[PDB]
Structures are given as structure tokens and as C-alpha cells.
Amino acid sequence: GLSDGEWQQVLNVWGKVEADIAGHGQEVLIRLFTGHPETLEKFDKFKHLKTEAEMKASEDLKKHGTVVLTALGGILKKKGHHEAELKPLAQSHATKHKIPIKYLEFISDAIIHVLHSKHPGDFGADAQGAMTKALELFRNDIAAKYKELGFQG
Numbered sequence: 001g002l003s004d005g006e007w008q009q010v011l012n013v014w015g016k017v018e019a020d021i022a023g024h025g026q027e028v029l030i031r032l033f034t035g036h037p038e039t040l041e042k043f044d045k046f047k048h049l050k051t052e053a054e055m056k057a058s059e060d061l062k063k064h065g066t067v068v069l070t071a072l073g074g075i076l077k078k079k080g081h082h083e084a085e086l087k088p089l090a091q092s093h094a095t096k097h098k099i100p101i102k103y104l105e106f107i108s109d110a111i112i113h114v115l116h117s118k119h120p121g122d123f124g125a126d127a128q129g130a131m132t133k134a135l136e137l138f139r140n141d142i143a144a145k146y147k148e149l150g151f152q153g
């Protein structure tokens, strides 16, 4: 788990995201889609986006970014006590959306990238460490739910 100090760092970093949830969410999804085009194919409603310019101009993509980061933020604020929040997300992502855990790794990495991109010099080594642990815990708890379901891809 994370220490109390680590959780405080995570939620301090999260304040940056909360100042511009839509902008952070958009950039995270664009980073995901451009770095890993296979991920776009899981989204019937984003498949039509043929260029990054189109992605940037998509108001629905920004909207989904808000949905994604709002859900993640609610989970992070539980500081690991997130079974009720996380279980349904894991199950919808496995059973309905068919999202391999690899893609959760990709989006976790995208979040770290976007934080540095939007806040260069203001996302310190301790902060990166703590946020990485939180995202690993999130991913790992999802992975346990995936194993329960026998879901791979």
C-alpha cells in the first residue's frame, strides 16, 4: 500500500488535475490513442477520429476525458479503500468494453506523461513516485478482478 505521506502527495498532485479536468482528460486520451492506435478501436464513438487534430477538436472526447478522470479521482480519494468504486469499473471494462490490462498500463503511463507535459518542473520525484504507486495499486486491483473473470482480452 501507500503510506499516509504518499497519499498526501497523490492528492496534492491531483489538485493540478482538478483545476482543469477536461484538459487533462483530453490530453490523457489523446496520448493513449496516438501512442497506441489499437486502443482507439475499442471506442466505437472515437474510431472516426483519423487525426490528432480531429481528436483535439472533439468535444465528445473531452467529455469522456472528464468522465474518466472524475472516476479515477473518486477512486484515488478513497486512498486504497476503493473496492465498491473499483469493482464495477473493472467488471465493465472486462466484460462490456473488453479492455486488456495492457491498455490500463498504457493509460497509467499516459497520465504520468501528461502531468510532466502540463507541469514541467512542478511534478517532482517524490510526487511521481507516489502517483505511480497509486496508479499501480489501481491497475493491480483491477487485475485481480480480471483474473476472477478469467478475462485476458
Ligand code: HEM
Pocket: 039, 040, 042, 043, 044, 045, 067, 068, 069, 071, 072, 088, 089, 092, 093, 097, 099, 103, 104, 107
Ligand atoms: C484510468 C483508467 C480508466 C477509467 C477511470 C475509466 C473510466 C470509465 C468510465 C467511468 C466509463 C463509463 C462507465 C462504464 O462504462 O463503466 C468508461 C467507459 C468506457 N471505457 Fe474506460 N476508463 C479507463 C480506462 C480505459 C481504457 C484504457 C480504455 C480502452 C483502451 C477504456 C475504454 C472504455 C470504453 C470503450 C468505454 C465505453 C465508452 C462509451 O462508448 O461511452 N477505458 N470508462
